Structures are given as structure tokens and as C-alpha cells.
Design a protein around this nucleic acid. Structure first.
Lengths: 116, 151, 65, 49
RNA sequence: GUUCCCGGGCCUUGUACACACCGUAACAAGGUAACCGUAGGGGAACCUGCGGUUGGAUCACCUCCU
RNA sequence: GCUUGAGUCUCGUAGAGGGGGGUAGAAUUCCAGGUGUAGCGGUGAAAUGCGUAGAGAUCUGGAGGAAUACCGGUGGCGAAGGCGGCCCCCUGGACGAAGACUGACGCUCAGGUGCGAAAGCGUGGGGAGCAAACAGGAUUAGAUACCCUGGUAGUCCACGCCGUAAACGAUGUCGACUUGGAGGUUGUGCCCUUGAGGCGUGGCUUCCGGAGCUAACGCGUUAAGUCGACCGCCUGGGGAGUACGGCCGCAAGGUUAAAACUCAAAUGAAUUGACGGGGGCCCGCACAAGCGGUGGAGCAUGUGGUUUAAUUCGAUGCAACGCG
């Protein structure tokens, strides 16, 4: 469907979760894959092996669409960012270009808080 | 033990063939220190295995040794903190210290007849790829390929 | 930011991304502000930054080992 | 091309650079014997094997 | 072979200890670093938010370029 | 009367210095629309909540709100506190080449006046994020405590009040004097700034050291070294930097600031041990690879317990149990 070749795989790795959301350049999403939606609940989601399983659940659900020269738009340098882009280049994809499109804030608003 | 980089020592060669592969197999097949009593048995065993195989008393032992000699022995040598086995290519001197150890463990199992005959069975089985001898060698090899990503 | 290279890769090549910041601004906009913190830890960091140069001055005059 | 086998790369100049003093004469680099003398004499440095 | 495990030694870091390791909030990084100032609150220690300082601890490993 | 003191002008630079207003862009909460899934979130773990009323995720348009990654430098400004986009106007303070002068016009303090982070509150507006009181699930014998999801006060703009601190390089202030190095930051004069510099002079700040001080660590031209001028504070700890009173405040309190009694020390620097679920190296069959055993079985021996007319006593983690 959609007659798309430019599968824009938005790989966002928060901290304990690798949620990849394949879409179109327009925004017409195709679906997703996650290190937590495949299992691995715990410090296991924190591992890129789960992110590897993630890039595979994302390697599928596109065999009805047909992405070939795909664009890897990464944001969220958490658990993924490594064995996820490499998993796509190992899943049979000719990535035209891996993009690190990070519209970083100047820390305008105030962010959450963690480990104390 | 923290310093040894020493190899192997000397053993008395076999009083028949110029093969010390056979000479090590006797010291391992013996028990309670009786090597004379044990050596004459290796002879009455090596004959009937070669007799049931198809060749001579020396190649029917080396060709029957390749079917029971691994290449890998996986050992516990970690780099991080997880528990995994590392495929370790072993030295050629220990490779025999793997083959002529299970063949002995074969001569002490399988209640057939005399020792020279039960052994004559298990290595003749190895000569045709079967039995418990060659069986454990298969199992170690399987321990290798399942852990070959950790390098 | 954007790596391409038409054909000689056989690899992802995200080395300029890490050579940009990567965790640089991750570690700065992910948790509570706490305005003063960096200042103090750059303190221990700076004194230990002069310490290796103090080790450079500690290797040039003697070391007759 | 060695200072320990022959001599100072430059006039009273050690191999490692432990002696960048054109006053230092005789004192060797304690790592490897570099007796500091004029590098020009290395047009007369005779060694052996 | 020293990376696993039991005991031992040397060097080193640290202590409001040297009588010598109802609830843990400080002393090892006490496994949540400390104290002052302010408002409020809870059986109570103290905690939460904001500002400052050093009367605080290791910068040792695991993957990549010369 | 004269000048090495204070001070100003001619000629210039830099800056999270302050003040009023306006504006650019990203992210976030949320709203509408197309696509689309059953998980998102979180922690050592679980869970509250949301979900076919379609969340999280993606692209476009957008209104409140607070704050400026990278430039960032034990760097800069200032009495101090404190303070990081840009522009317009206003403007204080610091410093320098070469001259012109009154001629010590200089320093500081009780009563007094002014600034005062953040917070409390009154008032005209506000609420994205975080989040006192509190609610749910857990760690737990217990939670009003580490954690997460919500949430009133506060946070912000403008005017004021109580007028407080580790308001601390803990180093009061004006000034003169006292071998150097690595520097950093901002100007200036001289020589060809041919050139990334050489020789001097001021402000602020960091490290190692001599003189000297010191309990010691160390400070060390920004001093804790040497003097003069001015003020505050201390007489062992606790009581207590607190009650009440003068003065002040709508509220929370603030400033000046004690006693009875008891104890016989309170405190600081600096070291060697004790311990460490802190780091490094090394030794022994500790372990890796194998051989034989106790425990299931038989004989001899021993201890506790039990019992008996009595079935000596001792040892009774490793180091007692074929030991006496």
C-alpha cells in the first residue's frame, strides 16, 4: 500500500525502550516495532539485543509496502542507536542514508528528573 | 599453577610399535598401577579391532583416532561479568588427552566380555563412527558452534 | 549528522554523530536542571586535568628507573 | 642511526630529548647510553658488529 | 593461564573510631554525600522545592582512530 | 607655597553589569485532520493512570508559559548579592599612551541610610515542567520515607512589607613594601604588527615554592609575611545566637541579646592500626583437566546423649571424634 519506497524508520530510543516507527516522508505511518512489545521486560529492554529483535519486528510489516532505499532518521541515543541501524543494514536494506535528525532544544522548557 | 609454561614429559615407548600415541593409551587404560597386565590387553584388543576394521594394527588406530579427536574444548574465560563459554582451540597434545580418555571410559562401561574385547568393540565402533566413544566427541563439537559469536 | 557514501560502506558509519555530541546534550537535557552541579564537578575535573600535565612534568626531570 | 650506538642527533642533543642542553657533555641517557658530544663528530663515528 | 572461588601479604584511599564496624539521617560513595538560610508539614528523625560552598568519593574498566 | 597621595578632562576598548519593552527558533502539555498498533510509561521489581470513547509514535497549522545546548575558558562584570540569545535608548564602574592643575581636597565607624539570592504574604493577571499538605500501589512488622502517576501553595510580570544566610577564596577596608615559572582574560607604548612576536606597565583569578608567620596543613605580590589608621567580636561547652521588653510587621517573625544550674572538657590539624560487598599484583592443588573416597555396605575405634550399682575426667569450629 501507499506505493512507498522511502520508508522513513524513525528509531527513537528513550532509556529503557526502543520504539521504531516506520512512516512516509509525508507522515503516513506504516506501523512499529519495540524492544518492549516483543518481550524482554526489565533491564532486558535496556539491551540492544532487544533493540536487535526490535529492528527485526521493524524489518517486517513492510513486505506489503516495499521499502528499499530507506532513510534511517535517528533521535534518542539511549538503548538503541547501535545494534538497530546495524540490524537494518543486516536485514537486507539498502539505506540511502542514515540520518541523525536531532532538533535539539536549547533547554527552553524544564525537563523531567531521574537518578538521585 | 601460576607459573607453569611447561609442556609434556617423557614416557617409555611401546615395546612393539614406534607409536607413542599407543604408549599413552596404555598408561591411561591401566589401573592400580599394573601396566604389564594392562599392556598385554591393549595388544589383544588392538588386534581384533584392526581385524574387524579392515587395515593394520597402526593405521586402524590413527584413522580410528580422528573420529574421536575434537579440535575444540570450551573453557570458562570471561571478559565481562556474564556467564558464557568461549570456543577454545586446544593444543595438539591435549587433543589426544581427550580421545584416549573416553575410549578408556568406554572400556569400563558396556558389560560385554573381556577388557581386550569390550575395548576391541568401542574403538571398532569408532572405526565406523558409532558407540559411546565417538559419541561424546560429537557432543563437545556441538558445544562449540552454539557459542561462536563471543570472540 | 547525515552520513551517506554511495557504495564503499558495508557498514552503517555513524562516527560523526558520536563525533558531534551524541551523549553530549543527552546528559544535559534528560534529567533535572540543578544549575550549580556542573560547576562543582568541573572543579574536581579541572584539578585532575592539570594533574596529568603535572605528571608530564613528573616524567621529564628524573625517572632514572 | 642511533645515539646509543653512535651519538647525539644534534650538538649535545639526546635521542629522547632528555638533554636539550648544549652544556651537557659526557652524561649519557641512563636508559640507553647517549654520551652527549657534537653531532658533527658523527662524520667520524666508528662502530662494529 | 589469573580473568572464577577460599584464605594471606605489600602499596594505596577513607574515618566526629582508638573503650579500635521507635528508625539508620551523618562517619567507606554508609549502597540517597554534607551543612548553613527560608516556608510548610508529619509520632519523630528528617524530607520536598530554591540559592551557595567544599568542612566530599573513583576517575579504575569495556568497545574504536595513530 | 611645592609635589611622589585623592580626583577630573581631551583621545579609546571589552563585557552572564543593571533597567523598560519588543522579537526569532526548537522542545513540551494540549486541540483539529490523514495513517496506524496493542502496548506506552517506570523501576532492583511491581503498580496508580491511559487504551476499539482509539494513548504513545509521524507530518502540517497554532495559542499560553518559563528558560537560552553547542560559542563556555580554578573565564568576565561588581561594594556585595547575584547574573549567560538579539535589537533600540539610558548608564554606573574598572584601565591605559602624552599633557594641564587646586595643592593632602585622604581613611573609617555607635545612633543613621541604602542593596538584599530564595522563601512567606497582600493585589491586577497566570499555571506548559517540576512539585510542600495529601491520595493509590509496593520496599516493610509500619509510612505520613528513596520510586512513578496526579495535584493546591510557590515559581513569572509590576508595586511593597518582616528585612534573613556556609551573604564563605570562612581571609574586614585605604595604602606602601617583599627572588620566579606555567598561564588565562582585557587594553596600551616602542622596533620592519616582514610573521604566528621580543621588552615594560595596571585590574581579576588558579597551582608549586623563598623570605616570614604557624599547632599543622599551608597562605605566599589576590597573603595567614611587615606597619600605620578605623570598627565589630571572644574569655571552656550547653543553656542560646532563644524566651520576653523598646522599635517594626495584615501573617511567618526580625534586630539588640541574658541568667539559675551542671559537666571538667568542647574543638582543630595531623598519623599508624581495625574494617570495607573500593583499586592493582602475587603465593598454596583455591580453580581449570583427570584418579581414588566419606555418605548406601562390612569390620575396628571414639564422643555427646540414654541407662545403669558404676558405665571417670578432659577436649567439645577450623586445631575434638584410631586423641590421652
Amino acid at each position: 500500500r501507499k506505493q512507498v519506497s522511502d520508508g522513513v524508520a524513525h528509531i527513537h530510543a528513550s532509556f529503557n525502550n526502543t520504539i521504531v516507527t516506520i512512516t512516509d516522508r509525508q507522515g503516513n505511518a506504516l506501523g512499529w516495532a519495540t524492544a518492549g512489545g516483543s518481550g524482554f521486560r526489565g533491564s532486558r529492554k535496556s539491551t540492544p539485543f532487544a533493540a536487535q529483535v526490535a529492528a527485526e519486528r521493524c524489518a517486517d510489516a513492510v513486505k506489503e509496502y516495499g521499502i528499499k532505499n530507506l532513510e534511517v532518521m535517528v533521535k534518542g541515543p539511549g538503548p538503541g542507536r547501535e545494534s538497530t541501524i546495524r540490524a537494518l543494514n543486516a536485514a537486507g536494506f539498502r539505506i540511502t542514508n542514515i540520518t541523525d535528525v536531532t532538533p535539539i532544544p536549547h533547554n527552553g522548557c524544564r525537563p523531567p528528573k531521574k537518578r538521585r | 599453577p601460576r607459573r607453569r609454561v611447561i609442556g609434556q614429559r617423557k614416557i617409555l615407548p611401546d615395546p612393539k610399535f614406534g607409536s607413542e600415541l599407543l604408549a599413552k593409551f596404555v598408561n591411561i587404560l591401566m589401573v592400580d598401577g599394573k601396566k604389564s597386565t594392562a599392556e598385554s590387553i591393549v595388544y589383544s584388543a588392538l588386534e581384533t579391532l584392526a581385524q574387524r576394521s579392515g587395515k593394520s594394527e597402526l593405521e586402524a588406530f590413527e584413522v580410528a583416532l580422528e573420529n574421536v579427536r575434537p579440535t575444540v574444548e570450551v573453557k570458562s574465560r570471561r571478559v565481562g561479568g556474564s556467564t558464557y563459554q568461549v570456543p577454545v582451540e586446544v593444543r595438539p597434545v591435549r587433543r589426544n588427552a581427550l580421545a584416549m580418555r573416553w575410549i578408556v571410559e568406554a572400556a569400563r562401561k558396556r558389560g560385554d566380555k573381556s577388557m581386550a574385547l569390550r575395548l576391541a568393540n568401542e574403538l571398532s565402533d569408532a572405526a565406523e563412527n558409532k558407540g559411546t566413544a565417538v559419541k561424546k566427541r560429537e557432543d563437545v563439537h556441538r558445544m562449540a558452534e552454539a557459542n561462536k559469536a563471543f570472540a | 549528522i547525515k552520513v551517506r557514501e554511495n557504495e564503499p560502506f558495508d557498514v552503517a558509519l555513524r562516527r560523526f554523530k558520536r563525533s558531534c555530541e551524541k551523549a553530549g546534550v543527552l546528559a544535559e537535557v534528560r534529567r533535572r536542571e540543578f544549575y550549580e552541579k556542573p560547576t562543582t564537578e568541573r572543579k574536581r575535573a579541572k584539578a585532575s586535568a592539570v594533574k596529568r600535565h603535572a605528571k608530564k612534568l613528573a616524567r621529564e626531570n628524573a625517572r632514572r628507573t | 642511526f642511533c645515539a646509543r650506538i653512535f651519538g647525539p642527533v644534534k650538538d649535545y642533543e639526546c635521542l629522547c630529548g632528555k638533554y636539550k642542553r648544549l652544556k651537557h657533555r659526557g652524561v649519557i641517557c641512563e636508559k640507553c647510553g647517549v654520551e652527549v658530544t657534537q653531532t658533527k663528530v658523527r662524520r667520524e663515528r666508528m662502530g662494529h658488529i
